Amino acid sequence: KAKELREKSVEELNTELLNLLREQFNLRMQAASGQLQQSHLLKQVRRDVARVKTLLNEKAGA
Amino acid sequence: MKRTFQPSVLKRNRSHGFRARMATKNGRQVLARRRAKGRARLTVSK
Amino acid sequence: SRVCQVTGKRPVTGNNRSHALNATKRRFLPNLHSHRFWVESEKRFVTLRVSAKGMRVIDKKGIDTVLAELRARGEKY
Amino acid sequence: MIREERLLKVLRAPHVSEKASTAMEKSNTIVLKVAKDATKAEIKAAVQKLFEVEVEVVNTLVVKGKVKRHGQRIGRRSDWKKAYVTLKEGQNLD
Amino acid sequence: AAKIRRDDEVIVLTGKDKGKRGKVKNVLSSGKVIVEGINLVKKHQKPVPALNQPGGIVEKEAAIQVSNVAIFNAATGKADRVGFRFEDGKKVRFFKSNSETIK
RNA sequence: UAAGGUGAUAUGAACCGUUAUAACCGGCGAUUUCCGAAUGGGGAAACCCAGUGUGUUUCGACACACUAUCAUUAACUGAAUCCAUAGGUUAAUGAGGCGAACCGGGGGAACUGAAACAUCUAAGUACCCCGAGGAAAAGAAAUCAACCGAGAUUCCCCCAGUAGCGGCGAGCGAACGGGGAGCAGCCCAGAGCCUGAAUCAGUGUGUGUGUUAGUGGAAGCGUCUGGAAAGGCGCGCGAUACAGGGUGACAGCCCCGUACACAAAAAUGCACAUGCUGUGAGCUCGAUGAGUAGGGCGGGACACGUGGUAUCCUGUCUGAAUAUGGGGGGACCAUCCUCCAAGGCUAAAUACUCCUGACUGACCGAUAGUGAACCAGUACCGUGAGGGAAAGGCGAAAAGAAC
RNA sequence: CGAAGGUGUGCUGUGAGGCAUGCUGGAGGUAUCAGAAGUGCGAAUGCUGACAUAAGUAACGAUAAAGCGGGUGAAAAGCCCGCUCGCCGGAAGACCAAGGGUUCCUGUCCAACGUUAAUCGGGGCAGGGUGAGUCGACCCCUAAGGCGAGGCCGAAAGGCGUAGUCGAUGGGAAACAGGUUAAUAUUCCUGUACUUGGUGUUACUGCGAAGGGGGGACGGAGAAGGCUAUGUUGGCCGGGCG
RNA sequence: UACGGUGCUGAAGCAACAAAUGCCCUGCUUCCAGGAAAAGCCUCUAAGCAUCAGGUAACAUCAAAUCGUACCCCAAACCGA
């Protein structure tokens, strides 16, 4: 997804990151209960977040 | 019968703990030696 | 530390030999002395822990020169 | 003022147990697993934002990890922070 | 640069199922393949209440060494060896005997 | 580079991926909690407590940066005290700590031997301390030699267990000279002319060649025994590849490789080539290292134990000449010969292996080999420094024994 | 078509030994003549492991003591329940510090551990459990003492020490009663309290420290007097009529 | 009534006497051997600031973080294998 997310603004990125974080939180909440029967999702979300962070760093002073 | 070891944590730490070891040159040397050996517990420190 | 500031004379080790040649370790300390030296240029006394040899050297050369040398060496006075 | 991002990270899970259940039912108090670094205020903030529910007070405690033995090898479970969060009267939590 | 792959029909050079043929089912990182119908073992499957397994003498396909199988060339009617070569900026396998590309 | 993947004990679950952002491998980046030199202050290491400033706030608070010490230089400030200096506050630069051995320096034992023991030996060893480098140190004759000559240092073989030293005991033990490895010479004590002239370091660029992923890489079938063939017996083929490892028993031709031939977007080592910054070459005139050389007293080093003892170093007290001069040639003198101390720099041959890769072994094969083939510096023991084990093998394949 | 190794047998050599072969074993061995040695073990109060002997012997860890009924169970002297009995009671009870670090509670299991059995356990496995403005630490302050910028001293390492900064075992703000869990409670809940900080206020109007002063701030023994904790008796209230 | 317990309910709830080694008492009396420190706390001003801040006054609001809290603790859990 990085090539797609690279074509964005800083503000845009930040919002996306926030959203991702929220999603992750939700997953965690679900995971703890017996709701989440799709574990890979959590793995994905974290990765996405990381990618976003990396992108942000690249943008701001690199 | 009052046996020799009469534990006290603070006393132990002050005596033998990491910071004490650091404080002196000989202590430092000891630490270094331990490291070289491969000790898991470098000091008395928990 | 017993070190002439002008000359650099430290203590050196050696032996006491007895009449039966019994070596025993000893030191040879330098003949140090703290002496106020008048510095004519700056118009003040500079105290220096110096050997008698150091003093002699100073006399020979001029205190100023000695001071300069010391400075060059990175030594406070 | 706690950062949104920080808040999201704070709260680890709901804690299911008899005691917890009792707390929920009788005293209107939810029992959460939270980050070990998460202070009380932060936790409260997280609760308010992320569950949308007024908080009366948060009590925290640190649970020490049990030492176990997997076959011959000894090994310790992690410490973790439990939080009893008391919700205001009439606050029903999903 | 792996000469045998998932969906290749192979012939067995050695063992109890030597001479027989079968499609490779899957290939393992250990340097062994599992081929369809070839190396069979009658495992005694231990029942478990969970996962809906009844438990019985199940005849399943054990692995075989990749070295023990060979890619079969349909044209020659025989086992062959595989070579590698670049056709149109892309690496492809070919039968050593007859020099034709694997497709 | 790919058709398979999501490290291991260790399956499963939920998934991703298959001609190219799945996974894997390599370059350059990003992230990099806390403790630790630990450096904002403190501290019972992985914890406690700040200050200042810049931004934000839903005004409850957040965030993130900086704040050690010393050295050096600079700026401002500044006592007794007039000027000054000490001191003080900032700023910049560097240092600090760790690390196997080797290296140089500062200190420095004893057991032991002498069939006792004190000189002597062990030994400038062990050990402690400081400092450095990929090597270090040494180094460009005030050196040897012998009236012939050699031509800085270092290292190897001789010289030679010689000459010597030595309670002339135990022991210690050269040099000259010869054969080799490698070889390199320069600058300042200073000013004149000429002005960018050799060389060196940092730093870009270019070329060559490595290194850090990789790619291709030959040729075998039948039959007998057998659980299985790579074995037997037949008949073939490859070989710049019969190194090695695996594969159901021993395989050149089944697999991985091997010989051989190729490969780098990116980073980077070493050679030369070249630009820029600093550095000054050649010429003439000189100048030619003083509390120094020597000496006395005391020690130490020289194979050399004070001896008839040259030479070097110096704790102590002295103290020249200064090239028409001075040093040395093993007491000392005379003659001759030979060199120019009291300022520096300097590659190579030499020393070592914590570590990386490749290959080898009349080396070990589980009481051996590392203490450690195994989750070992672990368990366990000890207040602590510290000590410190035992423990490998089902099968070809779990087909690990349903009922 | 069975290597080494293991184990029998037969033959053979003057001996160390050798050859052959049955069984076991399941993959290596190696003639000859040379070469090199970690080359031969019964002893070393040798070292390591294994296994004997004494011997089914001594002992089973305070002479506070048991008995029976029922339960569960494969099985009960030992576990659970009950009724008796006995022991401690300035402790063998209750609550802490130190030290330990999950031993707490529940379910479950009995190989090993428990000096016997064990259904039980401080044993195995799984899950649960520790809630603070006022308790303690942290924090502010210091003692003995430690470290210590500069500094003085010292071959080096380092020693001593000023300013300072650490250091409790001492000084420094504040909470009680009841109820509750299988397991926490001055921490949860119920009631009723207190503290010292900010911030904002209106009201007022001398505030301000690295300094001054007070205070904090203190020994042994003795003697009482006033009290309460607490206990006894009566009253009261509930129950009883053997 | 899952024989563990849970829910409701609830009388009197006084007096006298005795009484600590506990409290008043960091007191008092006495003795010689002559009995921590520093902060919190109260107070005084200096430099300062000056009609601002700061101080005390009540009242409102916010605040009190962090770590410990199980269990044993004269012992079968600590020091003695």
Swiss-Prot record, chain B:
One of its GO terms (molecular function) is structural constituent of ribosome. The keyword Transport does not apply. GO terms for cellular component: ribonucleoprotein complex; ribosome. It holds the Pfam family Ribosomal_L34. It comes from the Bacteria. InterPro entries: Ribosomal_bL34, Ribosomal_bL34_CS. Belongs to the bacterial ribosomal protein bL34 family. This is Large ribosomal subunit protein bL34. The gene is rpmH.
